Structure 1
Amino acid sequence: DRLQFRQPSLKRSLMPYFLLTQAVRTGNLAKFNQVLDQFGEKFQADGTYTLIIRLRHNVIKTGVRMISLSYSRISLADIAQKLQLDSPEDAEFIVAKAIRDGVIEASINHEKGYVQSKEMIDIYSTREPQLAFHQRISFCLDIHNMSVKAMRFPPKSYNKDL
Structure 2
Amino acid sequence: SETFTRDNNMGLVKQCLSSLYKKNIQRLTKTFLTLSLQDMASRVQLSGPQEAEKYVLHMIEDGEIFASINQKDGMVSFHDNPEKYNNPAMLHNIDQEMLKCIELDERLKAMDQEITVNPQFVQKS
TM range (shorter): 0.5 to 0.7
Q: Which residue of 2 aligns with 1:110?
A: 70
Compute the TM-score of the two structures, normalised by the length of structure 2. Answer: 0.55
- What is the RMSD computed on CA atoms of the aligned residues? 3.9
Give 1:159 shift.
8.2
In the TM superposition, 1:76-91 aligns within 5 A as 76-91=37-52
2:25, 2:44 within 8 Å by CA — same for their partners in 1?
A: no
Give 1:149 shift.
1.3
Q: Which residue of 2 aligns with 1:147?
A: 108
In the TM superposition, 1:4-15 aligns within 5 A as none
Q: Say if 1:156 and 1:70 are closer, same or farther in 2 by CA, change over 3 A.
A: farther
In the TM superposition, 1:17-96 aligns within 5 A as 50=2, 60-61=17-18, 63-67=20-24, 70-72=27-29, 75=35, 76-96=37-57
Distance (whole Å) between structure 2 residues aligned to residue 60 and residue 141 of structure 1: 40
Distance (whole Å) between structure 2 residues aligned to residue 158 and residue 68 of structure 1: 60
Structure with the bigger percentage of strand: 2
Give 1:115 shift.
2.6
Counterpart secondary structure, 1:94: helix
Amino acid at match of 1:140: C
Choose from 92, 99, 106 the match for 1:131. 92
The count of residues paired between Structure 1 and Structure 2 equals 108
Amino acid at match of 1:61: S
Compute the TM-score of the two structures, normalised by the length of structure 1. Answer: 0.46
